[PDB]
Point group: C5
Chain length 254, copies 5
């Protein structure tokens, strides 16, 4: 593998520590702020906490992996041979991606067919991660065909999730007040922006653009930014929607 300078290793280490601290803070906030909203939305906040808890644990492992993957030697960071690859992140995703959609459904309080919509979204998310995993461990050079096939098969449930978010949930969003509608539309925009990061990284790794110390650093920093935005800030938006709906129906504990 490529050698890293002190600054490159430090940048990746700092961004991983930032992700760990963000998940710990988000967990504390969701647990304690569950009591601030009406009792009807607390379940949704519970799920938010689970997400930032799981990712938190996983990031604590990833950080430990990163330190173990390099050794300091003559003012350079030289790979030790201990593995460090994105495949481990899939273990996080298979739990967090289905839970994320779950909280969005829970806070929405769908009047009809809530169970069927939630079940189909959870199945789509699980299938997306499960089909993505075999392509990720495929070597982009020796096994390009397998990587392309698995990525294309993984994109189908991703498109189904986007369709359900923008087409089915439109009519449910339209039944909320203006404040709640703005918050829900902003939450949907935050999914689209953050979730496309992962397929783009997969595609760049398929075309062999991720070689080099620069690319290695950028991908880890992008993972930390994307995970924090898609989990902690996403849960904060869920909390904001729950608080607004509690204020609308007069169920706010304050």
């Amino acid at each position: 593998a490529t050698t890293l300078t002190l600054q490159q290793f430090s940048t990746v280490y700092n961004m991983l520590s930032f992700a760990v601290a963000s998940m710990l803070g988000a967990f504390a906030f969701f647990v304690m702020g569950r009591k601030i909203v009406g009792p009807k939305y607390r379940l949704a906040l519970v799920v938010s906490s689970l997400v930032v808890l799981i990712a938190g644990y996983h990031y604590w492992r990833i950080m430990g992996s990163w330190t173990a993957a390099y050794a300091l030697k003559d003012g350079m960071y030289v790979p030790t041979g201990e593995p460090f690859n994105d495949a481990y992140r899939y273990v996080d995703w298979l739990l967090t991606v289905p839970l994320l959609l779950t909280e969005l459904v829970l806070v929405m309080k769908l009047k009809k067919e809530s169970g069927s919509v939630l079940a189909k979204l959870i199945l789509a998310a699980i299938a997306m991660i499960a089909l993505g995993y075999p392509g990720e461990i495929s070597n982009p050079e020796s096994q390009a065909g397998a990587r392309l096939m698995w990525g294309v098969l993984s994109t189908v449930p991703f498109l189904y999730i986007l369709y359900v978010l923008w087409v089915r949930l439109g009519d449910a969003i339209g039944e909320h007040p203006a404040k709640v509608q703005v918050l829900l539309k902003n939450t949907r925009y935050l999914i689209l922006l953050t979730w496309g990061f992962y397929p783009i990284v997969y595609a760049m790794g398929s075309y062999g653009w991720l070689g080099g110390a620069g690319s290695v650093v950028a991908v880890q920093v992008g993972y930390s930014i994307a995970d924090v935005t898609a989990k902690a800030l996403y849960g904060v938006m869920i909390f904001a929607i729950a608080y607004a709906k509690s204020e609308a129906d007069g169920s706010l504990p304050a």
Copy 2:
């Protein structure tokens, strides 16, 4: 022992980390969602949390064992001589298996003879694990007779547990509304499917089919899947039954 490739070791490590994260998330969810159901069912949820807490600790140990059982050497994972065997899992089972049945009884609110049914189930579960343990540490080649005898003796309380689940608890299940009856029958199906995994693994290890890196990987992955399904998803079903019964009697805090 057999040497592992990078992918085989990574697969086992990732599945163990997945089990740890699943137990931690389940624990947080049961603790926080205890307040979402009526006060009559909270004790049941408490027991659910205990299960996912205990298994969680144990999986954190198993993961640590797995890393200690192999060393990276010339792009292969070579056994270090530190032990790694299924016997340690029995220490988990002796607590979790009696507790699992316990929560199913607690959420059911048996009108008569609840204590006697629960006591007999707990004794059956303890006896099953206690008789299974001597056969597991029996060498399948030198001590085949002892392994067969202990497995057969362990299966008797297993059959008694299945009989009590399907024959005694039928009349109690029939006294619930349709939603609760569907949830209880699905919970019983989830026990039968997940619990048979363990005796099948024991029997395959008795016939010498578990040699080889492939079998080693498959058994650990199957253990992680079976444990997560039989503890975290099982507790989620217990939570669903408690929520449905709270909604039926008008005791839902919301």
Copy 3:
């Protein structure tokens, strides 16, 4: 010291891990089930949690000691020279034994002289452990006289505790309903059975019967069984008595 086989070391390690998991589960259960009983008994449950918390920490240390006391070498476990002896357990006992009696008094709600009875029991327990400690560190061969003297002096407060349990607390037990009387008598029987284990181990170590790998394994397994029964199951019985008394006076939150 004697060398251990793989199975002997594994058995001791598994029993220590079992004790750790049991104390962690008991702690979670007592903390969460405090809200299930009436407010008059919650203090008693609090003390229960403290016991299983303290022992839990101590067992986490003992486990760490055991691994450090032996090294794997030619398929045998050879002592490293790092100490491992029962004296460390006394540090646990000096806190847990006075607290155990405390919870039994607290749940009992003595009408008169509760303070004096509790104070005398706490002083007796402290004196018992404090007089036992100098005899334990006495070499059974070179310092037999000192060991005998300290054990005999330690037994006097033990007999006083048994006398107070069976003679003073008889009249208080007789003032409870039949269910509560059965639970209290069973709790008293559980003390007598579990508490005699420790003096028997001390006496066997005084007569030089504890040499050999078999004896070493048996004593650690017996310590784990006795501690779990005398702390976690004892607290569960305290919880059962509190729940029964809450149901009797109509103070049950459910």
Copy 4:
């Protein structure tokens, strides 16, 4: 790097441990004292806890770094070559500085334009830390120009934050009773005093005054004092303002 005497290393280690203990105590206090004030201010206290939680984690890392940066050798502490620099602290600041201002807004209960003021302050704080980071990793000798430019660009949002604190928030402060006005003015004075420490350290590092064991020790001790005062004591003042306002409107739970 310069060698440290035993006393210099010990002083830095003790001050880091002090910061860790202070953040842990502050976290426990804010979590438990949230229930002591009226429900209208609890959200503010929640944010306080998040701050002392995040910094706590980060200080636990910094302490671990410091021990790793030196080795004991011939009664002197000699640098090992493992890095130890202030850049890691920026990862803490980017979360804590926006949250600190947040709690001050939350406890204040701005009647109009609360959202816009809070958003502008959060953006200013993020920009301040983000522009400060490139100058900190700039070598003060080889890259003086870049360090000066980044520091000057970082000071603009700092001045905007001070202006908003003293000019916009004046009219809001004037609408509180005398006790609350005194507490708010003291809180504003505590920001000005503690926050200027960081730019002064940056400027001293730009002029090359931070060489030498004395300067190294003083800067770490100053960081610990400044962080504890600006986070734990600042949150205690937030708690005092919340308690005073709860007492003023008769919402105190006691």
Copy 5:
């Protein structure tokens, strides 16, 4: 430094572990028993928890230091050269000593000038520890003058604290019922007895009486006993006073 026998090292290690377990148990008890007293006294209990939490963390460090300060070699414990001295304890004291007095004021509910009395006591405690620290790191042989001067300057605020405890707080104590007066006087006696331990150890270290393995062991055991009595048992007395005052005014939740 002096070599230790197995028993001397074991005694110090066991007493440090005892202090850790005592602080953890005290923390759990204060957190859970806060709900058992009236809402007017809960803040006081919160502060109690903070004390036993901080000391707990610090003792976990001290224990780790002690193990690191010696190595097992030929059945003796030989110093490794890693430092172990009392100066680190001052980092604990500077937080815990001001908090201890704080809880005593908080539970007392001073009718007039509570703020001024508490502020003066906190300032006196901080000054006492801050003036003690420079004398502790003074070598008792080469720097006897500095040690004497710093100790004498540290004793002045100690005498002021004792004067405030016995002279100002007399009239406030006289306004409580007989039970509360007895508890307050016993709490004052527990301060005087436990707090004089520290200056006596300082004075003995000034006269060179602390050399030798015996003295080394005795001082650590005395520190553990004094800290446990002055923090955990002191908080238990605070809890007893709060419970008695809750029972007196009819604010007991039970």
